[PDB]
Amino acid sequence: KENIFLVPLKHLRDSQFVGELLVGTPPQTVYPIFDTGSTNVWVVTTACEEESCKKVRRYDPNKSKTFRRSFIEKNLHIVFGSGSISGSVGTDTFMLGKHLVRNQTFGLVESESNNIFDYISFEGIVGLGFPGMLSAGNIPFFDNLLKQNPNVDPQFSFYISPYDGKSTLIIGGISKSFYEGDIYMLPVLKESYWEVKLDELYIGKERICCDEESYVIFDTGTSYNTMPSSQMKTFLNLIHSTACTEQNYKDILKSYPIIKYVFGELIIELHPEEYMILNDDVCMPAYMQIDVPSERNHAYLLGSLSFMRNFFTVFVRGTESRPSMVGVARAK
């Protein structure tokens, strides 16, 4: 009975962090993406006979004594970048870091449509968002874990470290060996994504955003950072792709601007060596244009590669005594 426990995260060859999850009895091992930009739990099953599903640990429900199916024909389909996932719904017992989660609803990947799944070794998703993005089931996975493990405090934090393979997901609390200084908490505006109000956004000395209401989403399943299309045009007029090598990377980016996010009295800065990534012989901005249609108010994503590699993020679920908050600190 470990009230504070650690689930080690392994950065795969691509742009996602996966951890160990046991599904069923006797347990079957899968390595799903731990996602805070969605809520549903997906697991890749043996009913999927495509090569994209092969060469990856597949979960067989016919070998689980605790797997139960229902007669309601609730079929799930979610878009997943270039591909899409389609499957049925069921319930089984899960185990995440020596903690049992019984009678949990999850999606069973039965068809993988398009080569993205073959590249990333897709084995499932474990959503950690708020209820309301749950497509099927009565209770989300993380909510059910806290219910069946009352001693665990309703919070988890991500320590992202892809360079050395020491990334980890800590559930139930925080450790000073993953961050330095003090954590600044931000209130969560709307309980769909892990969303936070954004007051101002500065590219160098120029104010580019927050004429209208804008928000920040902390998505551990999105590698890059994002801005709306309107601000992304201004972003690239000031920030350009340049040729660089591993030896001259620091001197070339010495002239580049500092990106400042304003959260009330808190200011978060992304230095050029922190938001510029080296691919082949060019340094490119780790930023994307995604227009989030969930809320007409356009929002900004803080991802795993650029933001979380340098900042320790804390996801505090609200209870009857505290509201839901996101806390950020400098990574150690």
Ligand SMILES: C[C@H]1C[C@@H](N2C(=N)N[C@](C)(c3cccc(Nc4cnc(C5CC5)nc4)c3Cl)CC2=O)CCO1
């Ligand atoms: C408002 C947010 C919601 C986000 N969002 C998720 N966070 N979850 C889902 C399941 C998701 C969709 C697509 C990709 C990924 N993840 C992933 C990343 N990168 C690579 C490497 C190959 C390039 N493969 C996979 C994921 Cl997790 C659904 C989804 O829309 C997307 C950005 O807007």
